[PDB]
Design a protein around this ligand. Structure first.
Ligand SMILES: CC1(C)O[C@@H]2[C@@H](CO[C@@]3(CNc4nc5cc6c(=O)[nH]c(N)nc6cc5[nH]4)OC(C)(C)O[C@@H]23)O1
Ligand SMILES: CC1(C)O[C@@H]2[C@@H](CO[C@@]3(CNc4nc5cc6c(=O)[nH]c(N)nc6cc5[nH]4)OC(C)(C)O[C@@H]23)O1
Ligand SMILES: [Cl-]
Ligand SMILES: [Cl-]
Ligand SMILES: [Zn+2]
Ligand SMILES: [Zn+2]
Lengths: 369, 369
């Protein structure tokens, strides 16, 4: 099996569909990665994650280095063995979470020192942690510029990220086993500014990565602005490598991002909103706790193929969530992750069949009816 | 399939092993019933409950009449359909929970009026609720005498329960569909007093039930006293019908109760203590959160056949429980319920093979080493 081979099978406009072959499995693209920050996709066994259609999941350098610890996971056989997921795992580098979640941080050219609520993260340490975890797709250690940012602050932040991208490349390439078995993605920054996004794309392509993430979005800018930035930013990246939009997003965000050339996605929404009582359906999200569902015998969604919709009613899940029952979180999460995977499957099939424009139109008309 | 047929295949001393055949399945005895008070065995899909070996689960009239409501469950197709468990369900009658959980209660000869935190429960209403739920084994509506009780207060309480037992019998027999498809168990009371337990057994046998529960135990009396009461109480019940010890118990409680002629058990321990970090093993319970498990690659128990012990380490489950992760509760609960079922299977096989005395001795020597 190859370390990393991306093949585009079909295109429609800027949208692409294809596969990433890796040692631990194939990733069908466009792909959605369930988030498994604490070495678990919340409320799901790995077999259930797989049964929903997921090819790859996301972990987090920041969370795992604190609990249970990166050396500890390596001693226990690596993240895959530890959590029981034998397929590809992509790990975020800590670049964003260190700034989002730390109680105190000190930023410098070397890296970020932080208090968890004392540790260091640098490009070299981030790559090492991801090696200890046994990540299949390693993310470069970057800085997610706050939004909004002045052009000058966005520029100095992006430039630091590009120096850190080169340091990440070098640290990864130094570790022969990592370079042989894993892939490394760079992260474009530049806030909402076209010239900075271009300078960032140029720097990343000069270094050379297996894939290219669009960082610095899904930071409060809203969909119109995110799409505007994607319109110019994604074409700047190498066409022949995967494009990963970090942290995105709602179903319509995903569709529009695919229309703009994105191949990979991750988002906490399906899991987090599942636990909170929000279920995704082809007619839009529903709040299952609402009294209107108390006697509704229909499944969460009328077409969904997931095991939850084959067996249990809205009325039952309504009862479970209102009662604070763990099975409620389990069933809502499984359905929402399955819904996301079915969305990705419909995206892939429609691109392959040359009818993605019509799919996106039909999807929106019904989802927002 | 028969409505209810109990067959004893083998005996060793007072211990029995056999089967209860019912329309929705066979119950192997001695049997352990996982508790599913809120129409869910907490943190388990029904298929997982079944995979652990459970033949029957327990529900509760009191909880379900308040949330989601008995008429509502009946409108939705009954409890089995609602929760997705198609095998036998035994429902407790509300007699004990109404007094344990209600914020205010008014006890009278008619029944119990209570505030949930305003409703009524009586023998007739309890039987009706259990009909609406579609229970397979219906419990008579009784009163669980507090412990300790004076002989006179235990007597007046037991006598009320025996009048309520006759009213429960009559209400059940009046509902032709219930009498055709379900079974009715009476509940012996009498606190710790042999003469009252005898008077209660006599009254219940005169009425006639499909099975006989020993009520009024597991109320704070401790194992020595519980066993002392079982020593004289279980022989008073009809030998040819199942004997059900309500609310019991820890593994050693179950073994000793089987040695005293009990055929059926229910207890919240495996589920509740699973969520709290306690795992049952053949070498006794362990607190998985303890630091000693942080790097332990062994499964929860070295012999356990459950899916959890086939796939995940103590170290991983330790991490999950300490992190407050739902999957931690899921895996601990599945293991503990599987452990309980494996205990019951070893009990059944050892009785059938005429080596239960040796099993009980070996079990205790290792469990309490
Ligand atoms: C959608 C929902 O997901 C929640 C909450 C707020 O948005 C999220 C999702 N947005 C998001 N943008 C990102 C940008 C980067 C980035 O530039 N670099 C690196 N290394 N990782 C990133 C990860 C990102 N996640 O960010 C934290 O919680 C998530 O809204
Ligand atoms: C073991 C653990 O389980 C917890 C906590 C305290 O014990 C429990 C278990 N004991 C228990 N004794 C019972 C007696 C009766 C009875 O006499 N009548 C009827 N109708 N139902 C009964 C159910 C019973 N459950 O009682 C409430 O919480 C349970 O300790
Ligand atoms: Cl989540
Ligand atoms: Cl429980
Ligand atoms: Zn579904
Ligand atoms: Zn086990």
């Amino acid at each position: 099996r190859p370390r990393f081979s991306f093949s585009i099978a079909a295109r429609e406009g800027k949208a692409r569909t294809g596969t990433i072959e890796m040692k631990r499995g194939v990733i069908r693209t466009p792909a959605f990665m369930p988030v498994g920050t604490a070495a678990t996709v919340k409320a799901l066994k790995p077999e259930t994650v797989r049964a929903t259609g997921a090819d790859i999941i996301l972990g987090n350098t920041y969370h795992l280095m604190l609990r249970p610890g990166a050396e500890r996971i390596a001693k226990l056989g690596g993240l895959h063995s530890f959590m029981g997921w034998d397929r590809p795992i992509l790990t975020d580098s800590g670049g964003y979470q260190v700034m989002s979640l730390s109680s105190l941080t000190k930023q410098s050219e070397e890296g970020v020192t932080f208090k968890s609520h004392r540790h260091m993260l640098s490009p070299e340490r981030s790559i090492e942690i991801q090696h200890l975890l046994g990540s299949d797709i390693v993310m470069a250690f970057d800085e997610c510029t706050p939004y909004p940012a002045t052009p000058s602050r966005a520029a100095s932040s992006m430039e630091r990220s590009m120096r850190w991208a080169k340091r990440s490349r070098d640290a990864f390439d130094s570790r022969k086993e990592q370079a042989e078995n894993a892939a490394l993605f760079g992260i474009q920054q530049g806030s909402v500014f076209e010239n900075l996004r271009q300078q960032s794309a140029d720097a990343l392509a000069e270094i050379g990565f297996d894939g290219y993430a669009v960082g610095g979005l899904a930071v409060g800018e809203g969909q119109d602005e995110m799409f505007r930035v994607l319109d110019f930013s994604v074409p700047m990246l190498p066409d022949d490598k995967p494009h990963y939009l970090m942290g995105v997003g709602k179903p319509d965000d995903i569709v529009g991002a695919v229309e703009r050339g994105i191949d990979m996605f991750d988002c906490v929404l399906p899991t987090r909103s599942g636990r909170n009582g929000q279920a995704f359906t082809w007619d839009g999200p529903i709040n299952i706790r609402n009294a209107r569902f108390s006697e509704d015998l229909k499944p969460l969604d009328s077409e969904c193929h997931c095991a939850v919709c084959q067996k249990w009613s809205r009325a039952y899940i309504h009862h479970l969530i209102r009662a604070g029952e763990i099975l409620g979180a389990m069933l809502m999460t499984e359905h929402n992750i399955a819904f996301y995977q079915q969305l990705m499957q419909k995206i892939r099939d429609s691109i392959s069949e040359g009818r993605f424009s019509q799919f996106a139109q039909d999807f929106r008309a019904r989802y927002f009816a």
